Write a protein that binds this ligand. Structure first.
Ligand SMILES: [Mg+2]
Ligand SMILES: [Mg+2]
Ligand SMILES: [Mg+2]
Ligand SMILES: [Mg+2]
Ligand SMILES: [Mg+2]
Ligand SMILES: [Mg+2]
Ligand SMILES: [Mg+2]
Ligand SMILES: [Mg+2]
Ligand SMILES: [Mg+2]
Ligand SMILES: [Mg+2]
Ligand SMILES: [Mg+2]
Ligand SMILES: [Mg+2]
Ligand SMILES: [Mg+2]
Ligand SMILES: [Mg+2]
Ligand SMILES: [Mg+2]
Ligand SMILES: [Mg+2]
Ligand SMILES: [Mg+2]
Ligand SMILES: [Mg+2]
Ligand SMILES: [Mg+2]
Ligand SMILES: [Mg+2]
Ligand SMILES: [Mg+2]
Ligand SMILES: [Mg+2]
Ligand SMILES: [Mg+2]
Ligand SMILES: [Mg+2]
Ligand SMILES: [Mg+2]
Ligand SMILES: [Mg+2]
Ligand SMILES: [Mg+2]
Ligand SMILES: [Mg+2]
Ligand SMILES: [Mg+2]
Ligand SMILES: [Mg+2]
Ligand SMILES: [Mg+2]
Ligand SMILES: [Mg+2]
Ligand SMILES: [Mg+2]
Ligand SMILES: [Mg+2]
Ligand SMILES: [Mg+2]
Ligand SMILES: [Mg+2]
Ligand SMILES: [Mg+2]
Ligand SMILES: [Mg+2]
Ligand SMILES: [Mg+2]
Ligand SMILES: [Mg+2]
Ligand SMILES: [Mg+2]
Ligand SMILES: [Mg+2]
Ligand SMILES: [Mg+2]
Ligand SMILES: [Mg+2]
Ligand SMILES: [Mg+2]
Ligand SMILES: [Mg+2]
Ligand SMILES: [Mg+2]
Ligand SMILES: [Mg+2]
Ligand SMILES: [Mg+2]
Ligand SMILES: [Mg+2]
Ligand SMILES: [Mg+2]
Ligand SMILES: [Mg+2]
Ligand SMILES: [Mg+2]
Ligand SMILES: [Mg+2]
Ligand SMILES: [Mg+2]
Ligand SMILES: [Mg+2]
Ligand SMILES: [Mg+2]
Ligand SMILES: [Mg+2]
Ligand SMILES: [Mg+2]
Ligand SMILES: [Mg+2]
Ligand SMILES: [Mg+2]
Ligand SMILES: [Mg+2]
Ligand SMILES: [Mg+2]
Ligand SMILES: [Mg+2]
Ligand SMILES: [Mg+2]
Ligand SMILES: [Mg+2]
Ligand SMILES: [Mg+2]
Ligand SMILES: [Mg+2]
Ligand SMILES: [Mg+2]
Ligand SMILES: [Mg+2]
Ligand SMILES: [Mg+2]
Ligand SMILES: [Mg+2]
Ligand SMILES: [Mg+2]
Ligand SMILES: [Mg+2]
Ligand SMILES: [Mg+2]
Ligand SMILES: [Mg+2]
Ligand SMILES: [Mg+2]
Ligand SMILES: [Mg+2]
Ligand SMILES: [Mg+2]
Ligand SMILES: [Mg+2]
Ligand SMILES: [Mg+2]
Ligand SMILES: [Mg+2]
Ligand SMILES: [Mg+2]
Ligand SMILES: [Mg+2]
Ligand SMILES: [Mg+2]
Ligand SMILES: [Mg+2]
Ligand SMILES: [Mg+2]
Ligand SMILES: [Mg+2]
Ligand SMILES: [Mg+2]
Ligand SMILES: [Mg+2]
Ligand SMILES: [Mg+2]
Ligand SMILES: [Mg+2]
Ligand SMILES: [Mg+2]
Ligand SMILES: [Mg+2]
Lengths: 74, 55, 136
RNA sequence: ACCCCCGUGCCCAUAGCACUGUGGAACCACCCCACCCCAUGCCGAACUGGGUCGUGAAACACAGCAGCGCCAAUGAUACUCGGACCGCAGGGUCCCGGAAAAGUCGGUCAGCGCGGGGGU
RNA sequence: GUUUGACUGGGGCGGUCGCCUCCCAAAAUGUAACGGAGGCGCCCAAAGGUCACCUCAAGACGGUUGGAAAUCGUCUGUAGAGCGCAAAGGUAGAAGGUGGCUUGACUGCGAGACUGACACGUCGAGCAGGGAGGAAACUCGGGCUUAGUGAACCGGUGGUACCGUGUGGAAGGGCCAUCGAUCAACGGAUAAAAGUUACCCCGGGGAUAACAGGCUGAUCUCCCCCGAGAGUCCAUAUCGGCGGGGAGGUUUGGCACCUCGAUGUCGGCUCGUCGCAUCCUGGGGCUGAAGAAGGUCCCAAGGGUUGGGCUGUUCGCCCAUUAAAGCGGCACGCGAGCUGGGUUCAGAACGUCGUGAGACAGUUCGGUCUCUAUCCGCUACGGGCGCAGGAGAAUUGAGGGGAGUUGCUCC
RNA sequence: UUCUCCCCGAAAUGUAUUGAGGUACAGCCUCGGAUGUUGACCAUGUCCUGUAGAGCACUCACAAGGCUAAAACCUUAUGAAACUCCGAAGGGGCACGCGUUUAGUCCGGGAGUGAGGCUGCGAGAGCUAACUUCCGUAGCCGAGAGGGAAACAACCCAGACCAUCAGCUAAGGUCCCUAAAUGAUCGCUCAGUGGUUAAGGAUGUGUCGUCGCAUAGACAGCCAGGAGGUUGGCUUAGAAGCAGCCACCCUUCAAAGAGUGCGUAAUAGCUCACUGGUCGAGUGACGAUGCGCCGAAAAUGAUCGGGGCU
């Protein structure tokens, strides 16, 4: 009635204004606190990862619906 | 922008210590002449209780 | 007194109260000055005193309520299994919080009734009539 | 160039709801019919296929309006990085910057593109 | 011959040991407790691929069985539902509810990243072979995610044709699939294992219990505030509900700080000495104090505080007295001072428990208490020097010790 | 577990363990090589977060009313580790240096450490106990001498290369023991408070406010007075101002209230409120604070370190 618990690191991993290489993981989350943006892909656990290299950037609108996205260099 | 140490590093937190070390002061009674550019103003503000800022 | 409710046990610390600094109901009000827990029978003794002095008449409101469980380990054991399942319910009380307030009783009799009730509370406390008030 | 309609985006409640008024032969809408393309775990109600008329009834479009939502200051306070203290303790104070939540004043019933249709 | 886990506010009994979710966790991640709550060791050939369509809970009014909730109809209706199991995030342009065809619940790979001491674990664009659904863009290498798990060794089965001891074979082995793990103590000592010791031994520990001391003061003891009532009447002569605040440190305890290269433990005896919260005596107030005899509170620690029966007892009950038969501290004072009755060694017995060896909350008869005091402290007794000459006597008293109780009768 | 001086200098954490006072890996130390400012601090830009606070919009809890077949629903009103319409200060990543400093990283040889301790802040367990226990965070001890804190690892100041019968300062101090003003000014407490807690209690005292009564002559003193209904109704055996229950109405006045306290089972009796004379100026009740008072009893001899200080 006490002994139990468990430890699974989660969170944003690549924050806005950072230069991700493509295939980088940018957020680990359990649901859709972030929705995959333009240039972003989301795997089974709703991880968001770079589709192509660029500047990571965040779009915030109402915390029901914000999105991570890539603005490529060049 | 004259400065000197007038209180020891010892027994003071880490940022205060490394900041004293950045400003160029390594002994009480050291003095120095520092430019007024924002980051140096921020350093000499961060540890202003250790320093007798001249004016 | 005891609530009919939810999770058995809790924690504890403090900061000045917000949820009732002003006397809405009634005329006069006794009011806490210190941050103790108040809990159950302490209040109920306040209630039974004032109801003796006043009843057949007056309106008695108890704006405070034994929300918070508090625990006692058994008897005499070492720091052992878990915490102790029961013991008494309390109400945290911060200064400016209003515990009591009478209605339909003359100023002086409310003085004497607040005096009796406050002679059995862990905190010292001060009474007041309601100044001008806002918050509606 | 002015007007309005049909689509369609950016922005997605300061742009939403309620009460109200205005539109029909431009446009949209209801509407008529349906054995079949097609289709409802029963019903062409909805998808669907052929078309007037009629009617803007409902819908939709536009306009009014601040009852409701939504936005939301200033003053101050809570709390607090840092600095220095008190109380035996619960707990409290001071100087220095940072600074809410709520609530009051007020603000709104949007704003900005692309096209195509039809008016003048 | 051996085995007979670990954690553990001493050990044992109990509980726990891997994995998921939330709080603790101090707005990054991480973070302990025998902290607070709850779940997993599965499930689904469709609850999966894809492709098409539908939208929930709840309420109100109205209606056949009904009669709060069934079924049907209108209205309101960011979700108050649903999502196979827990909870959390997420979710209505669905991940929810239904139908169509289907297996991508793929083979060979893997840019680049999350996470871990390692070994593990997670996500993943994109390339080829070949498919599935869609008209198409395109989506598919199991499931809305997060638990449904097990290294290695040793082996069962099916492919493959690497090895194969002179040569060609075959036996045997290897490579690719795959079967065998409450190895749950869940990073898993052997393929294979329980007890007991009071007959006990060794190495260690004050890293850790029993005594005592310490810290604390829940429990214990004691005192104060209020004043409901009792006291015929009157709260406070006495008593004082329900509640509040303190003191002490003598109880049981918590904690584990010095002592495990030893700080001897119950009770008695002996010897004392201290506190005062005073049993007696002494002085006071008040009284529901006429006197007498009392009640209770205040001052007061000089002295005093009996002898027996029972029991190891401390206590406590009793006998017969008393002015009184006080309560505590002093390592629960005092074993290099005595007992040794009590409990903690070996024998033996009963009751009980254990198949046993043995055990105890026990009960019972028996059972080695170490001639020489170095220092300090104490009681007594001398020697030396000093006390401005050397001698014999008499002495002041700075200061210090002892003593200090009480009845009875009579006027 | 033995000879010297010189340079640097840790660990008592993490995960695993028939593991727990052992050991492996990592972490932190040192040495040599390589790079060669990538390190540190502080600033601006940008992004992330749900704590402090707050709030009831959901879940649970919950206080007084309204409507009502109680549920919902309206006004008023609260609590929250496992609630959140909101939500800071701070904190983390990245870039840049717009600016100061001096480390950082990679490679290879040698390690030790894996028993920690205290305090402040943030929590849990515990009594909001412990020189308590388990985490987080800062600093000291550990391995830190020196000055202060009587004495005292940890608290305050400050990091000891060697010499000096030179100087300046920190915390902390300036009557004597003791270096240094028996200093200066405006105050406060007469308790040795200072130099030992609280509920509670009190005309201690100094400072401020808020209220009333008044010199057309008030507060306390003194003389005179103290109503008739009515033994107000119930009440009880009796309760007549005064055991307890319903009110507090009229006549007169300058006027004495079905009325405050003592008395007696009940009465009576004595005084109270309000009204006069003579005084004769302040007086009375609340409330905030400064410093003091009581509340305040343990054991071998006392004391603030001592003398002693108003
Ligand atoms: Mg400091
Ligand atoms: Mg507080
Ligand atoms: Mg505060
Ligand atoms: Mg409020
Ligand atoms: Mg349109
Ligand atoms: Mg309309
Ligand atoms: Mg026309
Ligand atoms: Mg039709
Ligand atoms: Mg119309
Ligand atoms: Mg402001
Ligand atoms: Mg600052
Ligand atoms: Mg601070
Ligand atoms: Mg401020
Ligand atoms: Mg606001
Ligand atoms: Mg409009
Ligand atoms: Mg146009
Ligand atoms: Mg052997
Ligand atoms: Mg063990
Ligand atoms: Mg259990
Ligand atoms: Mg965190
Ligand atoms: Mg944090
Ligand atoms: Mg830890
Ligand atoms: Mg807990
Ligand atoms: Mg779907
Ligand atoms: Mg096809
Ligand atoms: Mg793929
Ligand atoms: Mg084979
Ligand atoms: Mg051969
Ligand atoms: Mg073969
Ligand atoms: Mg293990
Ligand atoms: Mg094995
Ligand atoms: Mg075994
Ligand atoms: Mg025997
Ligand atoms: Mg033998
Ligand atoms: Mg031994
Ligand atoms: Mg030893
Ligand atoms: Mg110890
Ligand atoms: Mg141990
Ligand atoms: Mg012993
Ligand atoms: Mg004991
Ligand atoms: Mg002990
Ligand atoms: Mg000892
Ligand atoms: Mg008590
Ligand atoms: Mg003890
Ligand atoms: Mg310890
Ligand atoms: Mg010894
Ligand atoms: Mg013993
Ligand atoms: Mg006495
Ligand atoms: Mg006497
Ligand atoms: Mg007498
Ligand atoms: Mg006797
Ligand atoms: Mg005999
Ligand atoms: Mg004695
Ligand atoms: Mg004892
Ligand atoms: Mg003894
Ligand atoms: Mg002996
Ligand atoms: Mg014996
Ligand atoms: Mg038997
Ligand atoms: Mg014999
Ligand atoms: Mg014997
Ligand atoms: Mg001899
Ligand atoms: Mg002579
Ligand atoms: Mg003498
Ligand atoms: Mg002498
Ligand atoms: Mg060094
Ligand atoms: Mg592990
Ligand atoms: Mg270890
Ligand atoms: Mg190592
Ligand atoms: Mg090097
Ligand atoms: Mg770098
Ligand atoms: Mg740099
Ligand atoms: Mg809070
Ligand atoms: Mg708002
Ligand atoms: Mg530079
Ligand atoms: Mg190495
Ligand atoms: Mg070497
Ligand atoms: Mg350790
Ligand atoms: Mg630690
Ligand atoms: Mg607790
Ligand atoms: Mg400790
Ligand atoms: Mg050490
Ligand atoms: Mg030192
Ligand atoms: Mg150090
Ligand atoms: Mg020192
Ligand atoms: Mg000293
Ligand atoms: Mg001291
Ligand atoms: Mg110490
Ligand atoms: Mg030392
Ligand atoms: Mg000087
Ligand atoms: Mg000074
Ligand atoms: Mg001097
Ligand atoms: Mg002076
Ligand atoms: Mg007081
Ligand atoms: Mg007087």
């Amino acid at each position: 009635n006490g002994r139990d618990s468990n430890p699974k690191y989660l969170g944003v991993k690549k924050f806005g204004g950072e230069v991700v290489k493509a295939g980088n993981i940018l957020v680990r989350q359990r649901g859709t606190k972030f929705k995959a943006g333009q240039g972003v892909g989301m795997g089974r656990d709703h991880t968001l990862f770079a589709l192509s290299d660029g500047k990571v950037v965040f779009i915030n609108k109402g915390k029901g619906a914000r999105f991570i996205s890539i603005e490529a260099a060049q | 922008m004259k400065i000197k140490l007038v209180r020891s590093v010892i027994g003071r937190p880490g940022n205060q210590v490394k900041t004293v070390q950045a400003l160029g002061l390594r002994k009480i009674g050291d003095s120095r002449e520092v430019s007024d550019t924002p980051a140096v103003r921020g350093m000499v503000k961060t540890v202003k209780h250790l320093l007798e800022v001249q004016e | 007194k005891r609530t009919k409710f939810r999770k058995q046990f809790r924690g504890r610390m403090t900061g000045d109260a917000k949820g009732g600094d002003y006397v809405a109901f009634g005329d006069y009000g006794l009011i806490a000055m210190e941050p103790a827990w108040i809990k159950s029978n302490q209040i109920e003794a306040c209630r039974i005193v004032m109801s003796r002095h006043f009843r057949r008449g007056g309106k008695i409101y108890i704006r405070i309520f034994p929300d918070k469980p508090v625990t006692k380990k058994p008897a005499e054991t070492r720091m052992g299994k878990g915490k102790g399942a029961v013991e008494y319910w309390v109400s945290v009380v911060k200064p400016g919080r209003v515990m009591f307030e009478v209605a339909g009783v003359t100023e002086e009799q409310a003085k004497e009734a607040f005096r009796l009730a406050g002679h059995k509370l862990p905190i010292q406390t001060k009474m007041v009539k309601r100044e001008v008030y806002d918050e509606a």
